[PDB]
Amino acid sequence: GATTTATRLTGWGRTAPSVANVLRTPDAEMIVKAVARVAESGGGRGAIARGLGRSYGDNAQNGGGLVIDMTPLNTIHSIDADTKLVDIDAGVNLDQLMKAALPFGLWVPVLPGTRQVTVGGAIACDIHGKNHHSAGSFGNHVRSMDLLTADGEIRHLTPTGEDAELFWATVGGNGLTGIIMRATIEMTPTSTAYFIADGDVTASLDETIALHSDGSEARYTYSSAWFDAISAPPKLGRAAVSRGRLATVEQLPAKLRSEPLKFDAPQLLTLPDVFPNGLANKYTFGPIGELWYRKSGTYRGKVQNLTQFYHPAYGPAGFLQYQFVIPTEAVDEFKKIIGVIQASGHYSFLNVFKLFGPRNQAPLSFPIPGWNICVDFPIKDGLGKFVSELDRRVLEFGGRLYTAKDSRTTAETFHAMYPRVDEWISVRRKVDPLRVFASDMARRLELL
Ligand SMILES: Cc1cc2nc3c(=O)[nH]c(=O)nc-3n(C[C@H](O)[C@H](O)[C@H](O)COP(=O)(O)OP(=O)(O)OC[C@H]3O[C@@H](n4cnc5c(N)ncnc54)[C@H](O)[C@@H]3O)c2cc1C
Ligand SMILES: COc1ccc(CNc2nc3cc(C(F)(F)F)ccc3nc2C(=O)O)cc1
């Protein structure tokens, strides 16, 4: 049942709302007609694909134009265990795909912090995960994709070939090269749905960095950390590092050998429920509390399912998610940014720390080799201007912001952060001269 309706659309950050016509149809031919309709106007105010709206900013909204909800196109066409390939519509989400692929011994090669993201969304933001340093981003694993272009045609793209340029423009392209309808993804072979994990707790930022620089990182396919962004030096940047690899069946305890590829993360066992009024006691902030934490977070060869290894903040004024990457070599500059954040008087509790590996050939891809950080700032006075200063520091240190998180950065800052934007822009103008594809972000970041 195809429907088009005016909808107030915000990203996950629940900010910068705009009203657009949301076309929601499970018919692929209907989607082609809409694009053909918009392109007939010679552009109009454009259209933009929307997945599960998990992006924090304004890349999946188009104020005064068209938004096409891709989530109804959620057919898994095929999964092959021999070729490791999945042929799926763009609307299928990674949780669905993970659940469907496990009985084949196939693993989603790149998984984000949440599993409620579409294949289209995964490609369009070139998403990264705990395994980036060893697997790359989501783009690295796409063997083909079908792109609906401005001309109303469906172009079949491959990473290497005669349409390679448009392929890598679409990777990290934020839906601005057209609409991904269908994609073939190569999966990661696995014999279990489990991880072999090693945990380490560090005392400071220096120690967290030394751990990631000592070579141990090459021993783990998956690696991420939670760090302290509020405590003053030297406690600043202390981390609970979580590193590991996917497990083989023999590495499992005998009671788990029966169902190696079974998934079992789910319980009503949530800590707010068991403990309504907190984890803290009289030891928590003293030397015993720090001892407890150090020993608890330090372990070797622990068998963990998906949620315990991979999936372990509320306020009235909303939050500001802020993610950036500083080049590997610029270590001192990275420490300086962290120092600035803790001295800001803006307090972040959920802090993701990860060292990214080698980057791909997508000119708009976010990840570069270096120190990746996500911080959550409660919205309060002076935040916007503070993060503009961070923007300046990130840019100055060869770093960039991530489109999947941004809602407020300027076009100038962004263009300087992405030195290959002119090249990307040139591909976009070839494939969409009329600006048939448009979004709030495109207009804000001057990518239109
Ligand atoms: C709790 C949480 C944790 C997260 N963790 C991570 C993480 O660890 N790593 C990471 O990289 N990201 C992470 N993200 C961000 C997320 O991976 C991206 O925002 C992703 O794009 C969301 O996919 P979506 O289906 O919601 O797409 P949407 O948010 O709906 O759309 C985002 C962009 O994708 C485009 N798009 C969507 N569908 C299509 C299509 N069919 N064809 C063409 N373009 C399309 C849109 O035009 C838009 O520009 C996280 C987000 C949340 C809320
Ligand atoms: C309140 O519940 C929670 C708890 C933890 C998370 C972690 N989410 C995230 N994990 C991330 C993990 C990475 C990593 F680890 F580097 F791959 C990168 C970005 C990430 N971004 C996010 C995000 O929030 O956008 C999200 C919600």
For the chain, the three-class secondary structure string (H helix, E strand, C coil) is: CCEEEEEEECCCCCCCCEEEEEEECCCHHHHHHHHHHHHHCCCCCCEEEECCCCCCCCCCCCCCCEEEECCCCCCEEEECCCCCEEEEECCCEHHHHHHHHHHHCEECCCCCCCCCCEHHHHHHCCCCCCCHHHHCCHHHHEEEEEEECCCCCEEEECCCCCCHHHHHHHCCCCCCCCEEEEEEEECEECCCCCEEEEEEECCCHHHHHHHHHCCHHHHCCEEEEEECCCCCCCCCCCEEEEEEEECCHHHCCHHHCCCCCCCCCCCCCCHHHHCCCCCCCCCCCCHHHHHHHHHHCCEEEEEECHHHHHCCCCCCCCEEEEEEEEECCCHHHHHHHHHHHHHCCCCCCCCEEEEECCCCCCCCCCCCCEEEEEEEEECCCCHHHHHHHHHHHHHHCCCEECCCCCCCCCHHHHHHHCCCHHHHHHHHHHHCCCCCECCHHHHHCCCC
List the end-to-end C-alpha distance of the chain, in Å, as a whole number: 31
CB 163 within 8 A of CB 357: no
CB 149 within 8 A of CB 142: no
User: What letters, b where the CB count within 10 A reaches 16 and e where it falls short, cover 39-54?
Assistant: beeebbbbbbbbbbbb
Q: Is 59 annotated as ligand-binding?
A: yes
Containing structural domain, residue 332: 1-448
* Resolution value, angstrom units: 2.5
What is the 108 CA–ligand 2 centroid distance (Å)?
17
Atom of ligand 2 nearest to the CA of 129: 17
User: How is residue 145 written in tokens?
Assistant: 């994709």
Closest CA to 225 of 247, 203, 199, 206: 199
CB 320 within 8 A of CB 376: yes
What is the 367 CA–ligand 1 centroid distance (Å)?
15
Distance in angstroms (rounded) separating the CA atoms of residues 192 and 249? 6
Closest CA to 195 of 258, 147, 256, 122: 256
User: What letters, b where the CB count within 10 A reaches 16 and e where it falls short, cover 246-274?
Assistant: bbeeebbeeebeeebbeeeeeeeeeeeee
Q: What are phi and psi of 267, to 5 degrees?
A: -150, 165
Q: Is 54 annotated as ligand-binding?
A: yes
Nearest CA to ligand 2 atom 7: 113
For residue 38, the cross-strand partners are none
Distance in angstroms (rounded) separating the CA atoms of residues 130 and 312? 13
What is the 361 CA–ligand 2 centroid distance (Å)?
24
CB 119 within 8 A of CB 76: no
Distance in angstroms (rounded) separating the CA atoms of residues 372 and 62? 29
Q: How many domains does the chain have?
A: 1
User: How is residue 290 written in tokens?
Assistant: 């720090």
